[PDB]
Design a protein around this ligand. Structure first.
Ligand SMILES: NC(=O)c1ccc[n+]([C@@H]2O[C@H](COP(=O)([O-])OP(=O)(O)OC[C@H]3O[C@@H](n4cnc5c(N)ncnc54)[C@H](O)[C@@H]3O)[C@@H](O)[C@H]2O)c1
Ligand SMILES: NC(=O)c1ccc[n+]([C@@H]2O[C@H](COP(=O)([O-])OP(=O)(O)OC[C@H]3O[C@@H](n4cnc5c(N)ncnc54)[C@H](O)[C@@H]3O)[C@@H](O)[C@H]2O)c1
Ligand SMILES: NC(=O)c1ccc[n+]([C@@H]2O[C@H](COP(=O)([O-])OP(=O)(O)OC[C@H]3O[C@@H](n4cnc5c(N)ncnc54)[C@H](O)[C@@H]3O)[C@@H](O)[C@H]2O)c1
Ligand SMILES: NC(=O)c1ccc[n+]([C@@H]2O[C@H](COP(=O)([O-])OP(=O)(O)OC[C@H]3O[C@@H](n4cnc5c(N)ncnc54)[C@H](O)[C@@H]3O)[C@@H](O)[C@H]2O)c1
Ligand SMILES: NC(=O)c1ccc[n+]([C@@H]2O[C@H](COP(=O)([O-])OP(=O)(O)OC[C@H]3O[C@@H](n4cnc5c(N)ncnc54)[C@H](O)[C@@H]3O)[C@@H](O)[C@H]2O)c1
Ligand SMILES: NC(=O)c1ccc[n+]([C@@H]2O[C@H](COP(=O)([O-])OP(=O)(O)OC[C@H]3O[C@@H](n4cnc5c(N)ncnc54)[C@H](O)[C@@H]3O)[C@@H](O)[C@H]2O)c1
Ligand SMILES: [Lu+3]
Ligand SMILES: [Lu+3]
Ligand SMILES: [Lu+3]
Lengths: 551, 551, 551
């Protein structure tokens, strides 16, 4: 192609950063102003403009705009302050954006397969411009973060992650593809909003539903290969948990909200013991709730507990769960799902009633907050664990900084900095009464999924096993400098999420090869330089044709 | 536009004559043989191959090939050997090819409008790739030359024709458009021809046919401009005359079969007298038939008799018509149509039975053989004219050479050479006993329409007046040379048909301006340069961008 | 893409076969005669036309055009009458066309990597409009059949060849790419040909040459992957054997004029013995030449011998070769090449001054005319062998039908039908005095390269071993009927080359597969239906967009 269609395609457009030669060769001369910018000027003007921006959503709507304008530029700036931009491009700003979706709508971004399209998903799947695709993120928006049902308003999610895929891992922007499935909704507020962008109708939980998913999986694979990466996101547990059991062994899929999480959690717990050094067998982990996040970590734990010569059975018997309906035990009045059954150990002599109550009775070495019900890690709770453990482990991942089970402060200050804390949300250093500063640890999934993703793709791996995430964990934590440890943080600084992911890549592509799960041939000798070589760069490319005089 | 499509479109492609640099900058490198030919080299490979060919229609096939192949090479070749290729790319071989259309089809060429498309003509009209179309050529296939109704097999003419408009006048191909309208055919054979490629049904003569032409008429002027020229062709006398009467002053249209013909005749008819010199007033013209081609002329004659000082009446009264049914006289039994009455004079004392009988009875000065009935211009008939006239004028235009009213020999020899003979069929010189080579001329309409077409175009004339044909006629005649006269031809050698039409273009555009029939401003001063300036080239152009250093 | 480009493309064009719906929707109405044809009427128009043809090259020309205007059709027509068209699209008419290339030239047909494009081939590769290429053919026009250095006039071989890959095996056209590499030329005549379409310089042989080959090999692989099939062709022995050993291991390359030829012969020879039954050990084999063919053939034989409980050494020791410099024995006066040594045995007591002479002293079971010098298997040479052996094997591969070492007649007759004949050129049945008719079997490589090519591709077989060709022969050979064996052919009817090749492919896949060299996963339980599926078709395909109401 040539001409303005060049300037129209974000994948090509370089704005003023187009060289005079191209500008001429390409028949652009006169379509751009007499100025030839660099990628540093263009970028400058950006911050120079993002600053004057007030609200974070406004900044989102701005940046997200340079995505459908100039692919390179958009992504260059991305890493430019990847640390600070991430929270606008993704969490939490995107939850805002996702709620606003349909109002702040401007240009479309992903792929849309509706239940009204059943029987033709393929052709649709064939409507997508991109030739080579390797990454696919899909959601049916049923559980858009803590916003619950958001229908197609949720497509904001796929869009976000795929950005990180590239931003911190180096996956090709073209090779990705966010997708949103529309089967209707349940949010009335959504069913009566003239600005909604999907089929106006209650969800579809009939057989039609699965078949549709089925049809799309095949359509995607059919169209792009069987090794093509398919990440399930924001779904309705039940489905999100069964749609995994089902296809995992059939396709190249994985669900971050589950596997992706458990990965980071572990990493946390891990690095903790690296400083605690407490003989596995004696551990006691108690959960403040039995949901998705829980069951998810609960097993990658057992999994690694077991990997240490422990029988799955005795392993999981070291895992206790406490959800709204009280403590998770045998025979209780409330209900307990199949996934729950294992972690539901026969009732202890005396039954607590307060999480705080439980803590005692059971006496866990560890305690994790995943109930998203605000601050339940009372001062008492903390201060009790703080007693029973010479160095307690507390993890409040609930989000946002509104739902955490507690705070970093109450955490350390109520334990003599004798505890090891980690927050799912962000939290500031903590200097205490003795001039002691404790920089805490935030467990974002951005720590895993992008790394695991790059590996599985560059390896032509055909399936993603749990041992992978379990291995992913290690990879991560095994990135914590002793001083980081000294500092007290159980997660590598979010400033270098790149390299960290790039490293995690390596170590995973290696692992893959060793266990012979990688089919990419022929195996390379230097995976380091291997991987590091395959990353996608924002650095512009000359569009000039290869002329050359002929002797 | 770039890539193979450059090589795929005939207008762009130029084969191995594509310069290394264009190849390189256009991305055609390694798509063409490393050799770089010139146009001549190419045009040579052609004439070399053409040589080893046998049947003309075989050639016509080959040649018409380079058309839908390399626009710029095809034509160069044409005006390269015009006098010799003319009767291949067009009559007579084209007559052959039309009857064979379907068995010799390889690729489509013009625009097809069918009554099945009635109501949507416009849309059809809108599918023609070209943007700027100035000259059109329509036909409904009813009377393809002497081959009659040929259904869609006639589309072989609009193309042939236009080749001349372009090769002779110097008109821009991408500005012409050969159109073919389908309303069934009446040819049973075709009707049963399994390769016939039109609608399988009787010719529709209902009201619909009228509306179609209309819809099309307007649909074309709409999309292209009411100043856009439309030439009617191989049509059916009855229609070709009314449509001519109708849209004449409504659009920029005319008809070759009538208008075109008429002019060329007179051309001869003046080149003759020019050597004869016989006081108009004593002139007596007689037609061997009274159809289309006769009345078409009969009036071009009048107009000029009346231009010389006669009155409409006194002029025609010097014209007589004798068709199959005998002498055309006031009250005669056979039918006389409104377009004949004028020339149907009052019965001369004696009514002749034979054309030769009439020859005496009337005592004409000029004899016109247009009945297309072969040798009816009997040696006697010759000898008679030759007697009663010390300088008889005989015109056998019937075609082909067979239907000819006679032959130059039986004319010149049977007159000692005291006859000014012209034929619508090719005849070589005739050396008699005393040893005198006379080159009888032929009156191809190819002399007219192009040059006029040429002028009417660039003059943005809105309507074609017959006065233009009469004028045109002079133009052509006045091309003659005393030597061309002394040689015996009243028509200029086909060889320089280039200049011949070009030169006519000028003189005609001039006439247009002066009578104000021209709307192209500003009116140049030196018309000669004007036109010679506006003639399409055959020589290659560049596609190479305009690159240059910015100081 | 729609409108004219869609019919401007040989791949998409369907001529009058475009449905009305495709016509209206794709904006083609009017652009095509109002007649919707069917492939059958189209193809019908072609034979009915080809008939009136005469010269064999003429037909060639006529059919090679259908190729550049409408794929599907061309081929449809092709395999329609593959037997009669094969020789026209290929040998022995192809050579007629290579010699006349440029003297016939109309439109480019493949890739062109000149030595002048050195250091840039990649880009040139990048100019090929096809995105997924899987089959490649390359040649340097140095030894194009018994014609010799033909320059870029030889491009016609890959092109043609490719046609059969398709027409015979079922390989997707857009995935095939024929290539020619201009490095100058040693044939003078061409160097003086004003039409010559290549580098008007002497054949470069310096280091630049190989380097270019390499630059290319990767260039291709770079763009189309590594597993991309690369068959060599009509090179100058020398390089053919070297580049062979070279890239053989680093690429999916192979050479038909070596590995292919072989396979056919052994398929002939395997056949013979099936009706001869003479326990290997007692086999003796001579050769009328030691150039290219000889060695190739020879070895695969050795390979099989080996296969049957033998030893490389003795094996070839059972093989002898008599070139134009006497026989290939130890210490002879002429020059023996490295590839020739393992067949240049130690001189037997008396040394043969003649083939006939060597025929006795050696008294071989099998004989093979691969000298292409003509009839050297004289009636004596025949009868002699006839005598010596009760069931003698004679194979005269030399081509055309002029270099044939003998003929089926002089074979079957001068042996009462005691021999096992097999010729390279074409020959029809032979009836004897005792009214005994025998069809002589022809051994074209067309029987092979397709089937295989097809296999390697579909199986992503990264490399092509010799154990496959030999395994190919067996498979081919195994396609013979006992009645077919009755008539006496060692080669199945060319009339069923489709299946033959397909079935050969099926057999090979399982092989490639079972031998763990097929990488395509998952390995299909049914190779039959498997291969049988992915076969390309000549049946047109709808263009209509997938439309459907939304409930
Ligand atoms: N200038 C450019 O845009 C440019 C230049 C050279 C190569 N390439 C591309 O590189 C590819 C060849 O790579 P390879 O086969 O040697 O690699 P590989 O086989 O080592 O990689 C394994 C698979 O992962 C894909 N892949 C590689 N890096 C990726 C990334 N960073 N993000 C997402 N997917 C990735 C590959 O296409 C391949 O299918 C070609 O498809 C080509 O299009 C692009
Ligand atoms: N990477 C991360 O940082 C990350 C990842 C996943 C989940 N999370 C956090 O975990 C929280 C829950 O997410 P989820 O996916 O597990 O949801 P979920 O619905 O699966 O979990 C809810 C569980 O918590 C229990 N619960 C709710 N309120 C309770 C209360 N007031 N007291 C006691 N138990 C209560 C419920 O019984 C239920 O079993 C969220 O706030 C989220 O921010 C963080
Ligand atoms: N530029 C040229 O050289 C040129 C141009 C136009 C027409 N022509 C020739 O004129 C001939 C007729 O064309 P037209 O358009 O006038 O056709 P037409 O059918 O309209 O007219 C033919 C006339 O001749 C009469 N006629 C038929 N047979 C006759 C016979 N046997 N004896 C006497 N009269 C007879 C008919 O009554 C009819 O009126 C054609 O054969 C054609 O070759 C030549
Ligand atoms: N290299 C090229 O291809 C090239 C270069 C210069 C101009 N042009 C073309 O010339 C046109 C401008 O015409 P102008 O205003 O100078 O002319 P003009 O005003 O002198 O002519 C008046 C009319 O005649 C038409 N015309 C001119 N030459 C013609 C021809 N050779 N055949 C058929 N129709 C013809 C014009 O389009 C115009 O409608 C532009 O539309 C442009 O596309 C082409
Ligand atoms: N599938 C087939 O049917 C098939 C395949 C390949 C080759 N061939 C035929 O094989 C013949 C040669 O091809 P090639 O590949 O062997 O090429 P080549 O040029 O490498 O082989 C020539 C050999 O024959 C010998 N020779 C030359 N003249 C001789 C003579 N006058 N007397 C005895 N020996 C002589 C030479 O020493 C040389 O060893 C051709 O005619 C060709 O038609 C047929
Ligand atoms: N209407 C159409 O033209 C149409 C429709 C559906 C699919 N397809 C094509 O089929 C391909 C899917 O192949 P698969 O995954 O089943 O292959 P596969 O894995 O079963 O086959 C192995 C390899 O052989 C190649 N291959 C298969 N048939 C071929 C042929 N006939 N000619 C040349 N190469 C061939 C494949 O591309 C593949 O790389 C897609 O690339 C798609 O473009 C075409
Ligand atoms: Lu999520
Ligand atoms: Lu006409
Ligand atoms: Lu060959």
């Amino acid at each position: 192609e040539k001409g303005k269609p060049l300037m129209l395609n974000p994948r090509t457009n370089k704005g003023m950063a187009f060289t005079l030669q191209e500008r001429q060769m390409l028949g652009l001369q006169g379509l751009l102003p007499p100025k030839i910018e660099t990628q540093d000027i263009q970028a400058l003007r950006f911050h120079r403009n993002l600053k004057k921006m007030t609200s974070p959503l406004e900044k989102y709507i701005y940046i997200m705009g340079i995505q459908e304008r100039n692919e390179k530029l958009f992504y260059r700036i991305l890493q430019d302050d990847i640390e600070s931009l991430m929270p606008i491009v993704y969490t939490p700003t995107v939850g805002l954006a996702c709620s606003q979706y349909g109002h702040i709508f401007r240009r479309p971004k992903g792929l849309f397969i509706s239940i009204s399209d059943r029987g033709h998903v393929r052709s649709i799947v064939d409507n997508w411009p991109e030739n080579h695709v390797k990454a696919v993120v899909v959601t049916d928006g049923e559980r858009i973060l803590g916003l619950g049902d958001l229908g197609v308003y949720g497509m904001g999610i796929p869009v976000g992650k795929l950005c990180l895929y590239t931003a911190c891992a180096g996956i090709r922007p073209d090779r990705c593809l966010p997708v949103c499935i529309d089967v209707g909704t349940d949010n009335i507020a959504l069913l009566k909003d003239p600005f909604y962008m999907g089929l106006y109708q209650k969800r579809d939980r009939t057989q039609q539903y699965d078949d549709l998913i089925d049809e799309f999986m095949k359509a995607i694979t059919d169209r792009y290969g069987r090794n093509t990466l398919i990440q399930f996101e924001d779904f309705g547990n039940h489905n999100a948990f069964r749609f995994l059991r089902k296809y995992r062994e059939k396709y190249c899929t994985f669900n971050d909200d589950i596997q992706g999480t458990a990965a980071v959690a572990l990493a946390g717990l891990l690095a903790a013991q690296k400083v605690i050094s407490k003989p596995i067998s004696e551990h006691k982990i108690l959960f403040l709730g039995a949901g998705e996040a829980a069951l998810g970590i609960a097993n990658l734990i057992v999994m690694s507990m077991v990997e240490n010569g422990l029988s799955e059975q005795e392993a999981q018997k070291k895992i206790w769960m406490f959800d709204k309906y009280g403590l998770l035990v045998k025979g209780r009045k409330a209900k307990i799902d199949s996934y729950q059954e294992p972690f539901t150990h026969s009732a202890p002599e005396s039954i607590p009633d307060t999480f705080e109550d439980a803590v005692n009775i059971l006496k866990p070495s560890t305690i994790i907050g995943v109930a998203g019900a605000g601050r339940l890690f009372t001062p008492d709770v903390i201060r009790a664990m703080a007693s029973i453990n010479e160095r307690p482990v507390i993890f409040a991942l609930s989000n946002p900084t509104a739902q955490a089970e507690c705070t970093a402060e109450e955490a350390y200050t109520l334990t003599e900095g004798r505890c090891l804390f980690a927050s799912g949300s962000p939290f500031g250093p903590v200097k205490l009464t003795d001039g002691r500063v404790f920089t805490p640890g935030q467990g974002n999934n951005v720590y895993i999924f992008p790394g695991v993703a790059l590996a599985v793709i560059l390896c032509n791996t055909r399936h993603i096993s749990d041992s992978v995430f379990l291995e992913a964990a290690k990879a991560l934590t095994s990135q914590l400098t002793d001083e980081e440890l000294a500092q007290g943080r159980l997660y590598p600084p979010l400033a270098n999420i790149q390299e960290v992911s790039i490293n995690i890549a390596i170590k995973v592509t290696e692992y893959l090869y060793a266990n012979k799960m990688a089919f990419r041939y022929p195996e390379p000798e230097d995976k380091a330089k291997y991987v590091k070589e395959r990353t996608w760069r924002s650095e512009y490319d000359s569009l000039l044709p290869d002329v050359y005089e002929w002797p």
